[PDB]
Design a protein around this ligand. Structure first.
Ligand SMILES: NC(=O)C1=CN([C@@H]2O[C@H](COP(=O)(O)OP(=O)(O)OC[C@H]3O[C@@H](n4cnc5c(N)ncnc54)[C@H](OP(=O)(O)O)[C@@H]3O)[C@@H](O)[C@H]2O)C=CC1
Ligand SMILES: NC(=O)C1=CN([C@@H]2O[C@H](COP(=O)(O)OP(=O)(O)OC[C@H]3O[C@@H](n4cnc5c(N)ncnc54)[C@H](OP(=O)(O)O)[C@@H]3O)[C@@H](O)[C@H]2O)C=CC1
Ligand SMILES: NC(=O)C1=CN([C@@H]2O[C@H](COP(=O)(O)OP(=O)(O)OC[C@H]3O[C@@H](n4cnc5c(N)ncnc54)[C@H](OP(=O)(O)O)[C@@H]3O)[C@@H](O)[C@H]2O)C=CC1
Ligand SMILES: NC(=O)C1=CN([C@@H]2O[C@H](COP(=O)(O)OP(=O)(O)OC[C@H]3O[C@@H](n4cnc5c(N)ncnc54)[C@H](OP(=O)(O)O)[C@@H]3O)[C@@H](O)[C@H]2O)C=CC1
Ligand SMILES: [Cl-]
Ligand SMILES: [Cl-]
Ligand SMILES: [Cl-]
Ligand SMILES: [Cl-]
Ligand SMILES: [Cl-]
Ligand SMILES: [Cl-]
Ligand SMILES: [K+]
Ligand SMILES: [K+]
Ligand SMILES: [K+]
Ligand SMILES: [K+]
Lengths: 305, 304, 305, 304
């Protein structure tokens, strides 16, 4: 399996490529950058190879700056980026991913560049790939953090909690308490749920990104591990129900023609299906509002081309 | 951490000891059997030590036939076993576990011998240990098997399924669909649930044991891995919600004075609590029917 | 990958199949027995499936009693067995493995039935397979135990010790101190080597089998884990230098036409090569004597057919 | 176990803290930097906590800028760093690690800041800690890289190769072919050793650092994983023989009063001993030449 990382010179790309190389299901990682940044990729390549030696792991680490270098990959991770920024990043998506289905119709693309929901739609539109082979990180990490917050409240092993945050990876994210469980027990029926402040929790999840930006400079190790989790789930055909930004086609509320954070059973074929989750009234209204923000943002992004 | 396996010369005990010794959290395993069966334990000890060498793992393997060889263990796994059956096995429980708490009050006892729910109660009574430190395998394996069947039906990663079979480790076991979820979604709302035959699944779970006995002679690898799973959850203080035979004290429908399969958050201190699971009508009726059978069988065991 | 276990009803076969199913590189385990023992395989199949559920692992467990059931396997493990016993077991080898190369020339056979060195030669002769795809457990476990004994003497992590016992899996086994090292340092130069009694150690390794036989009934968990280690090394193409019973063709002392415990670099193709280890005078003499015992035993076994 | 990372705002420190927090043996990581850089640590703390959530792992992440925030750590990883360079870095060592043993005598210090061998000596002197509890990354990564090159040459599993680069973490490093083995066989007797260019391999090992700095800006992931490997060996008392910068006291050729890369059996108590490795003529000459450079550079650092 070959995983290409476009934007490997950045904080997210660099750390993603390092942790992806450690996966046993990844035999080759190709670092992609602008032609005037490949020399920096030569250093990153050596540093990662040193990490593998230390961890007693093996992977092929190649470098390049052209379409021929990453088009044949099994997974293409887009981490290259910076209203007008959504423009410029959307253009980057286009330059890299336009017409990929013609050379490799079996490619899987995972977009991380923000706005992730908008740019996954751009990636799918320009790529020509099937809707099941183009996704974005979306609210995956947000859901995993919410999962930990609940597990710590009830003081149970993390694996016992199943939860998800759907919608935009941003202010309009929606927690789905209606499909949240602790050891299979609906969380509303668990002792102590009354003492969990869902709103504070969501707030902690929603603002963390901006707080990290103004202090450490931006997310790095968090998003990198989330990418690793998604790529492993795919390449090892694990068929987990993960919350990622995917193209909706009526599976939830007949909502259609948008890419947004939703539960998806993920395997080697990409999105095997979007789980038709049934939302309560409030959850449905918040989810509809979130779709409204993403669709308008997607329209402006496409108008820009 | 030291784990003692009583009944280590048997099918279950031997295999349990072997897989327990592979755990990083288990630094010593003590093989316990009757005095006449000591030499057999010497060979099993060496065989397990060979397994550790091949797995590049380590563990101190000790052997004994006396109380002083296991009373100070952190976990005592009870696999020694022959109504006439329950009586003799309860006598074995009493012989080995009477007055343990007087010498090791922090010991944890895991009962595996059948009837496990009954003998779990016997163990707690004769042990004098706290209710939270005496449990049984119960329907733990039954729940994990049910989990795989649901997972294979929806074709999802097994970790996505959380389900549970509570009550007797036997014919009166009760599946808790009310507390069964896939990715957090109530299983009733998952697409395709109509095509899942719950009753046929339960039959496969409750009947397999008899089928294995009639063919291979009895379960072995399955129960040994379940023992390994339970002991690791305890010694590593993982705080998982597993279904084990434990003493009920009014957590579910105010039922009391019985050891039966229930959800319990397990850690290094044992049963941290029995989760107050809310059951729907039919499930409640079946569970109460199962508590009746277990309580009756327990009184006869205690009387002898 | 499919691994067939012939003799799965026995102590070694049963436990081998259970631990092999737990390997991520093994997707199917086929239990093979005599037609009048398949019903017992039905119980073992269920018990193993229960073990996987408990360990949260997956494997396909099939059963059968004919050549069509195991001939297409990727690895065929022979654990079916009981001078005259060497006869009867050799006949069993023949019944199961004669002409396998005609239906599956890429099959790999791992013999465990004793005498392991003799019966690996029988298996290779009757199978028609290439010499690199037929081996036996040999002195693999014996070497691993010797490795632990040395590591405990020097109180170092086991991974630091590299050693091997070559020759017959029996009284004529030979320790190769000349190729024994602790962290790469020749063990003869390590502080405290003078306090290690090699003879007692070898004795502990040589007699353990008989002592276990007269007490617990025979080896079970030890040999099963050794089989698992060998199958994993093969199916995952790990290219370790493991000591197994293999066909010698002049790689050591120009010794040829015998199967005996020797170091072999092992991968998906079986024996990639027998490492031409250079033995000291005493080690060479003991190794030559061991070959003499195996060759005579092999001749008598073949005369029996 | 609590591991403190001083210099956590930097490339190495941040990445080191992230991978350390993933270790099961590390329950707490304390991020330490200068008072003005505290808010930056808040963001790094949250980023690492996100990584743990995604990896389904746990760890308490603390932050500080004072001695009291790290003196009680079990392992203190020194990654804070700017001859004028060595002097300033030695001043940093002194500021952070002076008098640690007075408050935490069982602390273990791992020095990473370059020149690592020199600053390891500085750390030991100013710390007052025992010689066995102060080490440096030294040629640990250099040895692991050399191991992979030999392994790829013979096309064997990497675990089959045991090799070692001792001496200075720099130009005067010395490979110990005399103590290099493949599967226990002396590498000199392994078929194909003639086709292995040792000198070209050493050049690739000693020059890569400069190449990474001139391109990516400096090493990061490699050294962070090496730190993670060393800390795990200590906290899990694995007793591996790893090459680290440690205080020599006559174990190799009676050389004394210098911290330099040498084989050391590492456990929870630190350097359990420096293995008395026997070197052949040329290797001995190169090692003595390297001890000269390190001792000289160490005296100048101490003088300032
Ligand atoms: N949860 C989420 O969805 C997260 C989203 N992200 C997104 O990831 C992206 C990268 O973030 P980060 O790595 O911190 O940013 P960095 O500035 O560290 O790296 C940016 C990367 O983009 C490349 N790049 C920038 N402009 C162009 C261009 N015009 N053409 C080609 N390549 C270009 C850079 O290459 P060069 O060195 O040549 O400039 C570099 O590889 C951002 O868009 C960010 O929003 C980040 C974290 C989490
Ligand atoms: N709850 C569950 O899920 C499961 C329950 N079990 C129960 O485990 C028990 C053991 O099963 P199994 O291992 O197959 O049986 P075996 O006959 O194979 O082993 C029985 C063990 O009990 C010992 N034992 C027998 N009689 C006595 C006695 N009077 N006093 C002391 N020790 C005695 C035996 O030692 P010795 O050799 O000296 O006789 C041996 O160690 C049974 O009660 C069985 O029902 C088994 C599997 C699953
Ligand atoms: N280090 C080593 O090399 C080791 C070698 N071994 C060898 O493994 C072999 C099996 O040992 P173990 O499992 O303890 O023995 P068991 O008696 O427990 O099992 C024997 C197995 O062989 C089968 N078998 C016996 N006779 C025949 C026959 N005529 N035709 C077909 N199948 C037959 C049995 O089937 P059924 O039930 O129908 O009889 C059963 O599957 C022995 O030869 C032993 O020497 C064992 C351990 C270690
Ligand atoms: N031995 C080895 O194998 C390796 C050695 N190293 C060494 O590690 C050190 C750090 O490298 P790197 O992380 O890339 O460097 P960075 O500049 O990225 O980080 C330096 C770190 O040191 C801190 N620091 C700088 N000046 C001072 C000071 N005067 N007092 C206190 N803290 C200070 C910085 O904090 P702030 O942000 O507040 O300035 C920051 O945490 C260097 O000395 C380098 O040579 C690196 C890699 C490998
Ligand atoms: Cl990282
Ligand atoms: Cl998710
Ligand atoms: Cl359970
Ligand atoms: Cl087993
Ligand atoms: Cl070996
Ligand atoms: Cl090393
Ligand atoms: K890899
Ligand atoms: K252990
Ligand atoms: K498997
Ligand atoms: K941790």
């Amino acid at each position: 399996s070959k995983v290409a990382v476009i934007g490997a010179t950045g904080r997210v790309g660099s750390t993603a490529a390092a942790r992806l190389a450690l996966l046993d299901c990844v035999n080759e990682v190709t670092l992609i950058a602008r032609p005037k940044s490949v020399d920096k990729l030569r250093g990153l390549r050596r540093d990662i190879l040193h990490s593998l030696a230390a961890a007693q792991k093996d992977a092929e680490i190649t470098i390049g700056c052209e379409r021929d270098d990453y088009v044949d990959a099994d997974v293409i991770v887009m981490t290259a980026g910076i209203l007008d920024l959504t423009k410029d990043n959307a253009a980057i998506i286009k330059k890299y991913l336009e017409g990929v289905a013609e050379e490799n119709p079996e490619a899987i693309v995972l977009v991380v560049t923000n706005p992730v929901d908008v740019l996954t739609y751009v990636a799918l539109k320009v790529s020509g790939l099937p809707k099941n082979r183009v996704i974005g990180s979306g609210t995956h990490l947000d859901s995993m953090r919410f999962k930990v917050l609940i597990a710590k409240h009830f003081n149970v092993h993390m694996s016992e909690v199943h939860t998800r945050i759907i919608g935009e990876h941003g202010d309009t994210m929606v927690p789905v308490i209606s499909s949240t469980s602790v050891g299979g027990i609906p969380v509303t029926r668990m002792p102590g749920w009354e003492d969990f402040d869902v709103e504070e929790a969501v707030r902690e999840v929603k603002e963390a990104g901006q707080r990290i930006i103004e202090t450490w400079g931006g997310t790095q190790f968090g998003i990198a591990q989330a990418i690793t989790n998604l790529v492993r789930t795919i390449l090892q055909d694990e068929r987990r129900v993960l919350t990622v930004s995917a193209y909706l086609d009526g599976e939830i509320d007949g909502i259609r023609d948008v890419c947004i954070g939703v539960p998806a059973r993920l395997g080697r074929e990409g999105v095997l299906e979007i789980v038709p989750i049934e939302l309560e009234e409030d959850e449905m209204r918040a989810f509809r509002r979130s779709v409204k923000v993403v669709k308008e943002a997607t329209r402006e992004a496409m108008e820009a081309i």
